[PDB]
Symmetry: C3
Subunit: 465 residues, 3 copies
């Protein structure tokens, strides 16, 4: 045999179609989709932008579909491949939130991303390769709306960007100029919103079953206070959020601070430095405060309650130190002691100002609210951005009416992670199927309780080729 | 066959026993121990807390022990498995040193850790699995005292914590409902304190020999000035230590600083900014110093000598810059130029104030001394927390009376690390055995010279199954 | 068989020769070269110092060369082996730029580095090992001048260091006391300076072809403004550079700042804080400025042009905030907003002050210019230190007169990286050969346009053993 890297352009309908047929292409594998990202001008991309574009991939012959996959499941299959993820687009250039100051300003420079479309034909290189029995093979890529792969504020003219944006793809593969086999086709079932059950029918020969949760943000405008950009650690998310709150939390002003809702409770800090918000004490000490000015603490920046308990973000701070700058008229914060977590950074702004909330909700300045970001990432899992919180308390799997498997702790996720050497595993059973979960309880007084959930069940069926 | 994840509770005696016997469990492998950590309340856990709990693991049948291992050797076998180590417990939640301010305050939230008990039955999955010849298999886990897995200060009521703490384990394994083999059983020999020799008797069929050193802290109270928490890099250890010394090293005071031992030599910094401690010059410059106050340098914060040479921590600083805060009455340090290393951060406080020391030793404030931490981690290697310093100068291995192997440089550690793709290797010979080492010399005037050492020799014997 | 780690000293001629012959050494593999680095005294090493020493390695028998490799190609073959690279020497101890203040001061402590000499005899351990047919095997290591592995300033007495420095090597290997095979011998061709073509003649049986670019710094003194040391990320390089410029960029002075060339345009910052450099606005605001002093902005710190466009480093800054220190008489910079990139940090100082430049070029203080570093790393790729910029726009490969392969985008680099699980791949064709590239265009007004390029083509030929 002789291998060759072959690249094809395709027809755009957003859906891209690529036709493979050549007297010398006997076999093929290792599909890679290229995407040309445009120059973005005017007044950031999600991490792994290339994978997030993909809605669905289908491989077909004259006899029909040979193999197909949902975009999220392809991404899940490549999540433990750092190289493939880097090629997708993961950089400060693509993923940091850039700002356009003038209508002619360049926000993002043009770039190319590469999406490794992992197929069952790559497992054993030439041995597993797709053979083309003088057949025409069609590769069909369905794209997600560009709204899903972009993080932006209200100021950005998304309407025009959406109208003008076009997917520019190219398909590459390793062709080979040169026995029956088996292939596993992933099948996905999504449960009804908040329903802790899902069923996979016609299970006759399954190699594995995976169970996970996705948040549903349909009851929101998909706006979040902060986003850390390229820096994706749990701490980066928390630091970006604390940073966004600080300029409204501690104010150096000549008289009571203006520009805040009437619902805002901004209190002058005593000589002591301690402000008491019920049971919580906040120690605030700012250096170089001008003589005509005082230090103020916003005691209800974000507040939620269903006369009952109050989830107050201002109460999550215990110490705030800094120095006022006479030159820039800002407080330059130094050390901050808080108890902010990954869940707080994952609360949509809509849930703070929801109908269930008896309070205003959001007592930030208009300047802070204008800086909020629309995040529509299509592959979010759990109830937080890092999928850190495990919300499944118990899992039961039934084969027919009999209990096939049951667990409390995620011991099936621990084994998945150990056996596949992955740090991003799911509750998986490796070998009809009915899945029932018991969700963990977060307070009814926590805004996160109101994030909608969807149960996802993935089944891999065995097929003869 | 058909695999199944089976979980068992066990009997507590601290020793946990788990009995495996089922007409359908034909074979098993991949043992995982779960541990429920309690809520810690009142006025941090070691990294890889789950592995550090284990004292010994034994697998037995009616015919006796099939396989057994010392806790440290199990940990050593899993040290290159990042996933297994993460599952053990390695997070900011578990490993950062948290503070309890009131008797009802929550220091640590409850959590579950998972310990992968790597056995010779996992190497080739089903091919290497332990077969149960209608036999009852007993798994016995011996636990370390909780004192070993916890990092705390004097203020923490350890007495009550120890009395109330209980190990809550559960054993999981992959069971299989379905020829003679060979297995390697690790055997460990620990030399006499400071003795540079150790012998393994009855060596007939060994697959490998490993040699390493452990510090012995019996001549101390196991108290250290600092600990970096979850951040475990060499730099994190050094930064945590420098940070702890700084508030006693440079003092902004109205008149000579009070609250220090009479042995303390606190000198006013000249207009020049340079203080000379013998041959060492320390440049100290603090901004916003009040008119009624002066800048002072502690010239003997920690001092050790056996009229001879002096190991002085204050002499390890060349430049200290900062700004005094009128609001908090503290110096907010900016840039620090020092020559502090990993060894300095690994010196037990006991060795500064030892009988060999002709000086007081420890001239820190009572506030600083109260913040010291008890560290009893059972798996420490070398003479520093990172096992960075190689203290073996030469190694000789004898098979009977003949020299089997000898080396100066750790070329056997370099090969171990290259061949096993590990960054945490030991001097290893891969294939009676007498090991003799020559230890490197650190100054007799260095407190670290007085850290006791133990030679550890691990031998893997071949057994027929 | 029985394996043994054998170490040999060798003869120094710089060229080291090692002779292997023993009645009991039947086979061998896994060559490791040890190097003793000396104590460096007076008034930093390149990362992977051990690999950068090697110019060439040759393995010979009585019948001639068995296998040989160029130092850069050995390094390229080991670039995806983190362990081997660490052993080479990659630490803060070796790679941070240390300073000697007195002629008796220790800049670097002595150390040992280990260079894994990867050979085709290591692929399948004993199966691929080199068999010694009662033959004498000679290993010849040719070393690079020490000038290549050292990063230093003008103050360092390199002349004396070079005269006194000696390579102290030792060769280790795994010997074994105990059918025809095939081995791939790498062959490298370097094109003429700036020539976008290269040819490999006598190609009869090649397993692969790799193509990459190297900068040629012969038209320079090999001096760069900054180097980040051990911290090697793109951001570390950028931060080190910004940091070096800042003290000349914003000056707090009593009257117009002195000590700058007459070509320097240092402007007083208005009360507004905004300085306009043509189309670019720089916001500069410094706190605690003494009453007798003003804030100045260097508006042409580094300037390049061929009455035309100007590449001005001062125009790459949009916001500079800080606080003046009365104690140290320095500005302590806080937040900086700039558009500095990896290319700016990779510009040799010679290109700023080149004949093509109609401007002075370099309007920094003498203090800043004295801090410049000589970097002679022999394995640099592309036109920047991180090899981030892809300067090949199109690649064409011809086998005879026929086009074997052609590409625009680096799809052959993407496949190399995916198939070899490497994040440091090259445009590679895996299976006479003529390579032609089209280089991308950077502005003629950019100093980087004048960095000389060399096309490198690597061919692996099949040999029978």
């Amino acid at each position: 045999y002789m291998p060759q890297y072959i690249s094809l352009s395709g027809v755009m309908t957003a859906i891209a179609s690529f036709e493979i047929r050549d007297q010398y292409i006997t076999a093929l594998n290792h599909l890679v989709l290229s995407l040309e990202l445009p120059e973005v001008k005017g007044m950031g991309y999600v991490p792994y932008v290339g994978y997030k574009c993909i809605n669905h991939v289908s491989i077909s012959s004259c006899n029909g579909v040979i193999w197909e996959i949902e975009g999220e499941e392809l991404y899940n299959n490549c999540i433990n491949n750092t190289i493939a993820l880097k090629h997708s687009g993961y950089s400060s250039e693509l993923n940091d939130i850039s700002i356009g100051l003038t209508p002619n300003d360049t926000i993002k420079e043009p770039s190319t991303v590469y999406v490794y479309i992992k197929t069952p034909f790559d497992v054993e290189d030439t041995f597993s390769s797709l053979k083309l029995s003088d057949s025409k093979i069609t590769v069909t890529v369905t794209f997600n709306p560009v709204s899903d792969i972009v993080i932006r504020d209200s100021s950005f003219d998304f309407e025009t960007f959406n109208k003008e944006f076009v997917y520019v793809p190219e398909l590459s593969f390793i062709g080979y100029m040169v026995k029956p086999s088996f292939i596993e086709k992933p099948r996905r079932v999504i449960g009804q919103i908040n329903q802790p059950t899902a069923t996979v029918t016609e299970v006759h020969a399954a190699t594995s079953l995976s169970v996970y949760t996705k948040p549903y943000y349909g009851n929101t405008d998909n706006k979040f206070i902060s986003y850390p950009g390229y820096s994706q650690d749990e701490k980066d998310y928390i630091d970006a959020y604390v940073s966004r709150l600080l300029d409204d939390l501690v104010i150096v002003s000549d008289g009571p601070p203006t520009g805040y809702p009437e619902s805002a409770e901004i209190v002058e800090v005593p000589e002591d430095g301690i402000v008491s918000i019920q049971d919580a004490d906040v120690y605030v000490k700012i250096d170089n405060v001008p003589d005509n000015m005082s230090v103020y603490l916003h005691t209800n920046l974000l507040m939620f309650g269903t006369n009952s308990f109050i989830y107050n973000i201002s109460k999550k701070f215990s110490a705030i130190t800094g120095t006022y700058s006479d030159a820039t008229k800002r407080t330059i914060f130094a050390h901050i002691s808080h108890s902010i977590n990954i869940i707080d950074t994952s609360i949509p702004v809509s849930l703070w100002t929801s109908q269930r909330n008896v309070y205003n909700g959001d007592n930030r300045s208009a300047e802070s609210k204008a800086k909020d970001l629309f995040i529509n990432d299509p592959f979010i899992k759990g109830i937080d951005f890092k999928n850190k919180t495990d919300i499944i308390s118990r899992l039961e799997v039934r084969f027919g009416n009999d209990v096939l498997y049951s667990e409390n702790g995620p011991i099936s996720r621990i084994y998945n992670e150990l056996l596949t050497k992955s740090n991003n595993g799911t509750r998986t059973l490796t070998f009809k199927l009915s899945v029932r979960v018991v969700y963990s309880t977060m307070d009814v007084n926590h805004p996160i309780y109101y994030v909608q959930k969807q149960l996802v069940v993935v089944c891999n069926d065995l097929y003869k080729v």
